[PDB]
Design an enzyme around this catalytic site. Structure first.
Site, short mmCIF file in Angstrom:
data_model
loop_
_atom_site.label_atom_id
_atom_site.label_comp_id
_atom_site.label_asym_id
_atom_site.label_seq_id
_atom_site.Cartn_x
_atom_site.Cartn_y
_atom_site.Cartn_z
N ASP A 181 -28.21 13.34 27.09
CA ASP A 181 -29.00 11.93 27.53
C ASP A 181 -30.29 11.78 25.95
O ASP A 181 -30.94 10.27 26.57
CB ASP A 181 -30.98 13.53 27.97
CG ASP A 181 -30.42 13.94 29.37
OD1 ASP A 181 -29.47 13.00 30.35
OD2 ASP A 181 -31.36 14.25 29.94
N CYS A 215 -23.55 1.38 32.24
CA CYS A 215 -24.43 2.36 32.60
C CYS A 215 -25.57 2.53 33.57
O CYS A 215 -25.76 1.59 34.32
CB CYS A 215 -24.72 3.11 30.84
SG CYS A 215 -25.44 1.22 30.50
N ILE A 219 -25.46 -2.07 29.26
CA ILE A 219 -25.91 -2.99 27.79
C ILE A 219 -25.57 -2.47 26.64
O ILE A 219 -25.00 -2.27 25.88
CB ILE A 219 -27.24 -3.66 27.54
CG1 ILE A 219 -28.49 -3.28 27.90
CG2 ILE A 219 -27.16 -5.53 29.23
CD1 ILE A 219 -29.37 -3.81 27.23
N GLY A 220 -26.33 -0.48 27.29
CA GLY A 220 -26.01 0.45 25.86
C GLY A 220 -24.66 0.94 25.49
O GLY A 220 -23.53 0.93 25.07
N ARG A 221 -24.83 1.85 26.91
CA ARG A 221 -23.06 2.53 26.49
C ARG A 221 -21.95 1.63 27.44
O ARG A 221 -20.81 1.86 25.99
CB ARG A 221 -23.58 3.70 27.61
CG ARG A 221 -24.16 5.43 27.19
CD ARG A 221 -24.46 5.66 28.00
NE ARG A 221 -25.62 7.19 27.52
CZ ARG A 221 -26.65 7.55 28.75
NH1 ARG A 221 -25.49 7.58 29.97
NH2 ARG A 221 -27.29 8.34 28.63
N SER A 222 -22.06 0.91 28.30
CA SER A 222 -20.84 0.25 28.48
C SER A 222 -20.66 -1.13 27.60
O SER A 222 -19.63 -1.48 27.17
CB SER A 222 -22.01 -0.76 29.55
OG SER A 222 -21.94 -0.11 30.56
N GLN A 262 -28.15 -0.44 22.07
CA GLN A 262 -29.51 -1.05 22.89
C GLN A 262 -29.73 0.05 20.76
O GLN A 262 -30.76 -0.61 20.20
CB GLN A 262 -29.72 -0.35 23.65
CG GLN A 262 -29.69 -0.91 24.96
CD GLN A 262 -30.16 0.14 25.98
OE1 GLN A 262 -29.53 1.31 26.58
NE2 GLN A 262 -31.31 -0.25 26.55
#
Ligand SMILES: CNCc1cccc(Cl)c1
EC number: 3.1.3.48
Length: 284
Positions: A181, A215, A219-222, A262
């Site tokens: 998380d 995600c 933009i982040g995990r992806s 991110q």
């Protein structure tokens, strides 16, 4: 500057936040006018994350062709990815229309439906074989064929039927279920293990349309997923592997979608994944 030595200097100098702000500063800014039209307001999960006009995926319908999704084209790596937000209750039909129209073989999901007590995306696939889904607005049927639940991820076989033509296709759903998380994973081993499974399946290969990866905002995990894949593909390919510069690869990707990576932790995780990943590929 090889990277591991460089990673180790940033660490002792603890300048990840500084590297990262440098990237934020030189990233591209291209127009996102279609995303901001009032008729699309309910098609964007986050007010501040939009696809550029020039690289957005267009739906094949005259009514409204807009979805929050971008084509990231890595010319030297010979890879294409579609990066998109997690589907919203009113865009689940648009999501599967895109999958159909772009001829994708795989969908990569890097979030859980609920995180931090709040919904991060719609439940957009069926959970039981005998309970299929039908998307009336786009005329598609979606059936769960099988499910393969592992410790860190789940792989599902789905069947997507175009009701207009009764063509069917097998779609593979690759779901990474253990990203915390907060923060990033401590080790990249499970994430690399997940990435290679996706490669094995054929979902990333030029005989299919581009893989769809998401995600919550896309933009982040992806971004971490396509950055670690493209860097490893460039390092396997070039004459001189030490000439892969993860910051330049990231800036190139950011020409096609804003905001990729991110946080500075995601930036650091991304280095570790590539280093350890390049370590595995060569046995050392
Ligand atoms: C033939 N290329 C081997 C290699 C070297 C360095 C890194 C990777 Cl991933 C692969």
């Amino acid at each position: 500057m090889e990277m591991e030595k460089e990673f180790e200097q940033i660490d002792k100098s603890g300048s990840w936040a500084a590297i990262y702000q440098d990237i934020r500063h030189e990233a591209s800014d291209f127009p996102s006018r279609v995303a901001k039209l009032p008729k699309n307001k309910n098609r964007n999960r986050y007010r501040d994350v939009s696809p550029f006009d020039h690289s957005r995926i267009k739906l094949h319908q005259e009514d409204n062709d807009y979805i929050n999704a971008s084509l990231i084209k890595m010319e030297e790596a010979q890879r294409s990815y579609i990066l998109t937000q997690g589907p919203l209750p009113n865009t689940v039909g648009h999501f599967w229309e895109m999958v159909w129209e772009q001829k994708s073989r795989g969908v990569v999901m890097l979030n859980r439906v609920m995180e931090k007590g709040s919904l991060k995306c719609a439940q957009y696939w069926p959970q039981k074989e005998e309970k299929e889904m039908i998307f009336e607005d786009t005329n598609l049927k979606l059936t769960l064929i099988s499910e393969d639940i592992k410790s860190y991820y789940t792989v599902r076989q789905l069947e997507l039927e175009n009701l207009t033509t009764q063509e069917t296709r097998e779609i593979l759903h690759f779901h990474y279920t253990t990203w915390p998380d907060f923060g990033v994973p401590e080790s990249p081993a499970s994430f690399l293990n997940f990435l290679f499974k996706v490669r094995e399946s054929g979902s990333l290969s030029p005989e299919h349309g581009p893989v769809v990866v998401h995600c919550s905002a896309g933009i982040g995990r992806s971004g971490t997923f396509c950055l670690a894949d493209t860097c490893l593909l460039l390092m396997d390919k070039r004459k001189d592997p030490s000439s892969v510069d993860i910051k330049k690869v990231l800036l190139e990707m950011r020409k096609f979608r804003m905001g990729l990576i991110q946080t500075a932790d995601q930036l650091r995780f991304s280095y570790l994944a590539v280093i350890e990943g390049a370590k595995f590929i060569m046995g050392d």
